[PDB]
Design an enzyme around this catalytic site. Sequence first.
Site, mmCIF file in Angstrom:
data_model
loop_
_atom_site.group_PDB
_atom_site.id
_atom_site.type_symbol
_atom_site.label_atom_id
_atom_site.label_comp_id
_atom_site.label_asym_id
_atom_site.label_seq_id
_atom_site.Cartn_x
_atom_site.Cartn_y
_atom_site.Cartn_z
ATOM 1 N N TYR A 74 -33.515 -53.232 -102.989
ATOM 2 C CA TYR A 74 -33.569 -51.935 -102.471
ATOM 3 C C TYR A 74 -32.488 -51.306 -101.695
ATOM 4 C CZ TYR A 74 -36.056 -48.293 -99.515
ATOM 5 O OH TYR A 74 -36.396 -46.852 -99.063
ATOM 6 N N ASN B 87 -46.497 -47.037 -93.890
ATOM 7 C CA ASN B 87 -45.380 -47.192 -94.600
ATOM 8 C C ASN B 87 -44.444 -48.175 -93.990
ATOM 9 O OD1 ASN B 87 -42.570 -45.859 -96.434
ATOM 10 N ND2 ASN B 87 -44.017 -47.182 -97.612
ATOM 11 N N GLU C 220 -32.585 -43.060 -103.628
ATOM 12 C CA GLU C 220 -33.282 -44.071 -103.161
ATOM 13 C C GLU C 220 -33.253 -45.194 -104.497
ATOM 14 O OE1 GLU C 220 -37.533 -43.677 -102.143
ATOM 15 O OE2 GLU C 220 -37.229 -45.186 -100.556
ATOM 16 N N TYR D 83 -34.556 -48.848 -106.475
ATOM 17 C CA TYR D 83 -35.303 -50.082 -106.468
ATOM 18 C C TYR D 83 -34.920 -50.881 -107.916
ATOM 19 C CZ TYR D 83 -38.936 -47.828 -103.497
ATOM 20 O OH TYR D 83 -39.366 -47.354 -102.188
ATOM 21 N N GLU E 284 -42.264 -53.919 -98.890
ATOM 22 C CA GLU E 284 -42.479 -52.590 -98.871
ATOM 23 C C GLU E 284 -44.095 -52.529 -98.909
ATOM 24 O OE1 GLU E 284 -40.511 -49.390 -100.863
ATOM 25 O OE2 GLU E 284 -42.053 -47.947 -99.793
#
Length: 183
Positions: free
Chosen positions: A68, A34, A77, A79, A170
């Site tokens: 992000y 990741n 978090e 997006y 990502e």
Amino acid sequence: TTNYWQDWTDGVGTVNASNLAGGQYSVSWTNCGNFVVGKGWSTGSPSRVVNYNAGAFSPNGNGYLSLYGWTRSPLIEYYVVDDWGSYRPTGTYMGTVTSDGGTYDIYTATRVNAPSIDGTQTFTQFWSVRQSKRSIGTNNTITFANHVNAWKSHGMNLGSSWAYQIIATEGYQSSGYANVTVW
């Protein structure tokens, strides 16, 4: 203009990222774990208008191109996903929002004792995911206030403490190539 460069990887596989001039960056990756790489602002803002042009975004497998960022208290978090590779991210459907020429599904999700900007934590994701992939190589705007205000309407209130806010490439267990300019 941008003030911040993010070059985070979990160290799995090979991820090479380049802090180019101004708001431009590139990243090549091969069999990654990741990573989250991009350019933007060290303190996010709910009313920021973000512009980008991805000269290239070619995941081979799972990769995202998104606005992000993170907030704290609570830990969130978030997006705004404009492009993706083999896998469209989803969660629990809350509604849709139409902004900058796209219609986005809105999702929530809980991440339990998962990796975060503070190590292992239980936190929430707020997602806007475009229903179709946005064009690549064009000057694209994300009017983030539209997403923030759509999220608020569903009880998805962002934390009071803002961390960074970037147009991010990502990857997840994939390979690929991206080149993006942010302003």
